[PDB]
Amino acid sequence: ASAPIGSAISRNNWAVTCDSAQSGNECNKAIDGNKDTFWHTFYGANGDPKPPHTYTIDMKTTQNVNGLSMLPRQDGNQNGWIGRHEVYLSSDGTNWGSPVASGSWFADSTTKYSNFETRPARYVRLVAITEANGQPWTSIAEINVFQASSYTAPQPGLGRWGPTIDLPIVPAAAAIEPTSGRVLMWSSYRNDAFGGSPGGITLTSSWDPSTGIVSDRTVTVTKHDMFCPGISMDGNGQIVVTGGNDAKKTSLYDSSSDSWIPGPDMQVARGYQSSATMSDGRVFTIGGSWSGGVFEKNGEVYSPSSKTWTSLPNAKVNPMLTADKQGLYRSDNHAWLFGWKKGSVFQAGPSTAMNWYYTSGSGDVKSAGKRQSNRGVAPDAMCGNAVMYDAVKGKILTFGGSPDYQDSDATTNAHIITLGEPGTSPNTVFASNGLYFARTFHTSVVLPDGSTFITGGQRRGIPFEDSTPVFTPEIYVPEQDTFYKQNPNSIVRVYHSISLLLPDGRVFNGGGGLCGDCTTNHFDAQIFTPNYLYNSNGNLATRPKITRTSTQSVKVGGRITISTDSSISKASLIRYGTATHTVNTDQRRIPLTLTNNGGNSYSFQVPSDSGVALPGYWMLFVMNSAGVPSVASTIRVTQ
Ligand SMILES: [Cu+2]
Ligand code: NA
Numbered sequence: 001a002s003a004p005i006g007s008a009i010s011r012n013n014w015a016v017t018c019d020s021a022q023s024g025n026e027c028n029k030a031i032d033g034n035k036d037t038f039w040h041t042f043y044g045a046n047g048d049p050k051p052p053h054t055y056t057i058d059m060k061t062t063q064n065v066n067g068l069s070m071l072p073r074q075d076g077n078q079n080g081w082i083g084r085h086e087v088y089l090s091s092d093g094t095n096w097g098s099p100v101a102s103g104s105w106f107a108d109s110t111t112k113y114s115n116f117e118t119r120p121a122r123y124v125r126l127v128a129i130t131e132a133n134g135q136p137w138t139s140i141a142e143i144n145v146f147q148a149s150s151y152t153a154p155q156p157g158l159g160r161w162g163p164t165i166d167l168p169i170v171p172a173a174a175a176i177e178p179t180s181g182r183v184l185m186w187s188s189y190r191n192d193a194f195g196g197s198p199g200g201i202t203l204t205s206s207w208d209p210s211t212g213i214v215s216d217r218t219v220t221v222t223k224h225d226m227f228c229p230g231i232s233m234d235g236n237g238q239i240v241v242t243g244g245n246d247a248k249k250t251s252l253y254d255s256s257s258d259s260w261i262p263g264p265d266m267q268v269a270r271g272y273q274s275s276a277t278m279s280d281g282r283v284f285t286i287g288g289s290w291s292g293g294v295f296e297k298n299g300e301v302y303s304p305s306s307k308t309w310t311s312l313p314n315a316k317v318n319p320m321l322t323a324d325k326q327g328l329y330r331s332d333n334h335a336w337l338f339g340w341k342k343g344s345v346f347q348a349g350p351s352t353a354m355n356w357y358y359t360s361g362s363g364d365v366k367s368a369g370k371r372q373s374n375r376g377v378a379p380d381a382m383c384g385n386a387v388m389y390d391a392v393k394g395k396i397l398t399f400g401g402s403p404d405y406q407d408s409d410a411t412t413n414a415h416i417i418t419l420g421e422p423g424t425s426p427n428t429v430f431a432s433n434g435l436y437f438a439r440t441f442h443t444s445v446v447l448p449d450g451s452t453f454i455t456g457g458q459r460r461g462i463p464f465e466d467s468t469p470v471f472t473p474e475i476y477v478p479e480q481d482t483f484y485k486q487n488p489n490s491i492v493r494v495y496h497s498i499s500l501l502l503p504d505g506r507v508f509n510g511g512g513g514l515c516g517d518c519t520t521n522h523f524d525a526q527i528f529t530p531n532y533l534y535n536s537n538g539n540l541a542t543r544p545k546i547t548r549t550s551t552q553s554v555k556v557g558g559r560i561t562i563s564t565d566s567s568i569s570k571a572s573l574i575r576y577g578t579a580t581h582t583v584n585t586d587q588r589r590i591p592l593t594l595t596n597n598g599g600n601s602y603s604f605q606v607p608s609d610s611g612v613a614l615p616g617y618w619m620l621f622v623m624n625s626a627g628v629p630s631v632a633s634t635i636r637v638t639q
Helices: 027-031
Strands: 015-018 053-071 084-090 101-104 112-128 142-147 160-166 173-176 183-186 202-207 214-219 230-233 239-242 250-254 259-262 274-277 283-286 299-303 308-312 337-339 345-347 353-358 364-370 385-390 395-399 414-418 427-430 443-446 452-455 474-477 482-485 497-501 507-511 524-529 546-549 553-555 559-564 570-575 578-580 588-591 601-605 616-623 633-638
Touching: 015 027, 027 053, 027 142, 101 112, 101 214, 112 160, 112 524, 173 230, 173 497, 173 507, 183 507, 230 283, 230 578, 274 337, 283 337, 385 443, 385 452, 443 497, 452 507, 497 578, 546 616, 546 633, 559 616
Parallel strands: 101 160, 230 274, 385 588, 553 633
Antiparallel strands: 015 053, 053 112, 053 142, 084 101, 084 112, 160 524, 173 183, 173 578, 183 202, 202 214, 230 239, 239 250, 250 259, 274 283, 283 299, 299 308, 337 345, 345 353, 353 364, 385 395, 395 414, 414 427, 443 452, 452 474, 474 482, 497 507, 507 524, 546 559, 559 601, 570 588, 570 616, 616 633
């Protein structure tokens, strides 16, 4: 199940309008209180008019609306189940604006919801764009609208949340398809659950930001239930998905061909391990006792060229284990890995102990010291996040998490780690005064300007429970060493949530749940628009445009020339992300130094070290003096 974020609005005084209604299937059956009766558009003898179909409610008065529920027909018949839809709100009945929510609902008879930020409205409209099975009708047994306790206008200058993207699944794993710009999401063998999988199948769903279309596909060709995996974008731009529900499998997603290819089986079965792309395009993984057994799981490395997994038994997992109370089942999970120079992999945590992993010969591990600051040694921070926001300067910000995976209080601890050469102990300091809010299961992304956006989580980690939610996101501004609260959202984002940076510079945040019958499944995502996209008036700022790119494929150390439509002050390269269970080993930012060629023509060199400029796809953003970023250009970085 799912749940709405508000309380049902009394349907007494309401007045409803339908585009069509078959007699016996009146518009009003949708608001009778009887689940046996439903509104149904014309059929048979009244003809079969195709969607869009629309349901408009006049609440007579103004309510602080935050959601809607749609119970489909409960009579065993599927006809009229709503697929694609859009939700609109109006104070007047004529001016509807942009949808506050849109997306697709799964094809079943369960109640479906639309949760969105609170907005005063007297009118609500639900547009059924499609029918779950591609037929013409639209049927609704019951429709409800929910209201918030109160309404507080977002504060100016602090970003904005919305709209809501409704999905058929809980997106507990997601990636950006670099060639298409779509967000690829997956759940498990089911849309809302992972427990009890026969393995071998995964439900995926894609959202296209340009069209707003949500497309779904069941992947069986790799014979892998991809829930709880390792995820990396290799040196070729293929997304490598490892283990999880099918503990030894590897599935490869090729963005180019929009397809899934079986990969080689790993040497060791794992679930919940992290994997990290290396300076040579190879993928290194270690740990993962969620599945495949609980024992010491040492490193192994994937070669995309030979398509083999090779064990690195001397890259030992032992030094990175946390002191988790549940033991090894959790202590080797979600390592904070970063591919670095010369085939090295840095492990920044969650264990207090940081380590250098080496991939030559049969592997090696060397101590990189303890995460600590003038305030003391940092405790284990399972599900804390770690972001490389300046790969050139080896800067990684770490924050949040808790000593144990669950039933433990989250911390506000935040640190800056500065990496040097593999093998050396990196410098670590405390980040400002730590987070404004202790959180675990939160997610984050590095933004075009080098700031880190952090959102969601709870103060005490209780998987599948929406308790102690943190609704106020924070942004860390490295130049200032200061954290800033942003406008809060209304949907709890705790365990199984995700965040990705979109090519347009906005953040996609969604998921949470995946517990079958629980009521904490969140079949949606929201978009957070950072204040760098608005001008002073609260309107969207005008964005610099990248008119020309000399090339879209460059070797490390290579130069790129661009022309813009306006003078640019800054530019950054952001590697495309992948995300699940707080882990994102693929995102990273490289600040670029620009050569002004005169005439709004500029060049920059990509760093010559492939451990900095990890191969794969990257997003190129340019910023005007105002700080407003362009939409990204996609550049492939090869060694
Ligand atoms: Cu999980
Ligand atoms: Na009804």
